[PDB]
Amino acid sequence: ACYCRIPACIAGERRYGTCIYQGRLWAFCC
Amino acid sequence: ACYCRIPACIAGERRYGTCIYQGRLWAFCC
Amino acid sequence: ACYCRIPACIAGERRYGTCIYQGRLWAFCC
Amino acid sequence: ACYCRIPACIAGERRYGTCIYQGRLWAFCC
Ligand SMILES: [Cl-]
Ligand SMILES: [Cl-]
Structure with missing residues (x-):
């Protein structure tokens, strides 16, 4: 899965x- | 989980x- | 112009x- | 300025x- x-x-x-969520930047990882 | x-x-x-990957925009859904 | x-x-x-720049989220405004 | x-x-x-607007991805260039 990806996270x-x-x-x-x-x-x-x-x-x-990259994810944009809850006012933050996240790494999109698989 | 979110997707x-x-x-x-x-x-x-x-x-x-929003997710950004593989040059594409995705809805980030929970 | 936009900012x-x-x-x-x-x-x-x-x-x-939205802009992604310098580890932060920005509003894209015109 | 950045563009x-x-x-x-x-x-x-x-x-x-990166800029996200009008459903499109743009390079953020300075
Ligand atoms: Cl932190
Ligand atoms: Cl702050």
Whole structure:
């Protein structure tokens, strides 16, 4: 699955984009 | 869980933001 | 002209979108 | 000044972010 994350993607994931949610920027990670 | 969706959120969800990935815009739905 | 603004658009402007810049969200105002 | 551009920033500028408006993605160039 993919996840919007703060502060960063985790081990085993790659950043594929960005989420805008709750007034913050998130890494989009899969 | 929240989900990035095209074309729109499904009944029972609301749009709380936006995902940007693979050069495309997605609704962020929870 | 249009401007990316924090915290908000100003008098005489309308918000038409969002900017992502310097780790922050900005109102896109014209 | 910074500018939202399609297709890309012009020589002498760099891309520092992204604009979202009118349902479209733009390079944010300064
Ligand atoms: Cl923080
Ligand atoms: Cl602040």
